[PDB]
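pasting input
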Amino acid sequence: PAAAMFIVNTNVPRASVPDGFLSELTQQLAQATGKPPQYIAVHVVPDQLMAFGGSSEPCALCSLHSIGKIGGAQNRSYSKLLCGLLAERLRISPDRVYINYYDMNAANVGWNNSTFA
Amino acid sequence: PAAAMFIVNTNVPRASVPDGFLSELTQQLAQATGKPPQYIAVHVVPDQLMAFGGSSEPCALCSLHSIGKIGGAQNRSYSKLLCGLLAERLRISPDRVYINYYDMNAANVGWNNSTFA
Amino acid sequence: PAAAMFIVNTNVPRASVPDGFLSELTQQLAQATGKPPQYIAVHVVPDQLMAFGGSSEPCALCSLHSIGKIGGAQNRSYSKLLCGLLAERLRISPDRVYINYYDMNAANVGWNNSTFA
């Protein structure tokens, strides 16, 4: 199925989030997952009270929930992509980023008054 | 056990969140799960920077973590309920909502200086 | 591997969050998990619109994602620790706290352009 969602939490200021970033994340993830952009959801949360390694330089905590398209090599590619994007667009060092991956069962994803199973 | 928690993240403005909405979610979920309202926790996050399908009309990303009471049919009923509530109260179209469901092991839920196992 | 991350969401005001709290959480969790503080990430979210049991006294919803070091007894110790910290520092009653525990596969944790597997 086509469902995937990406969340990034960061201490980086809202002003540093470029315009079009939501569409950028959406479409890059659509390319990466082989899912249509219409069912990719994205959520960016700046100005958070956060630390990585006990210090407060720019950092991010992210998650990608997806129905399928999750696994070792795939997650490696996603990590390369997303760390690249966060470094280029949000000035965050890749070694200060965690991304948690979740392969969701269709039956555990609600949408449009039902689930995807 | 009685533990369940619901989170909704949305780009909908804080002003559009009606008064009593937390209690409404709590009690509707208590009905739905057959759990006492005293152990239902609720978290609503408005004004978020979000997109669904690459566009920023009202949308929501939600999760329901629960000890038990999670599964295909149950999740379908929850989705009908919650999409209904989000549409009625938050003006969000049900086809712009994801709800992730999690059946949590008692041993993986901390509360009151211990866990539920 | 060394990766662990902790998030706490609470309705408690930002002003009630003491200075040094991020480092405190980081180091206490480093002690608790036997992981180096350099790979512990922490995220604190105050002033949230939240309820526990349908009422809005101070409460928290937290999560600890970790590569390993998760299980029954361990989670009990973590819960004692974290509820203690939240009560002492954030004035939150331990019976109004949920902490969800996640043992993450190395292959499902992205960091530094790759994963931990």
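fyi Chain C is about 25% helix and 30% strand.
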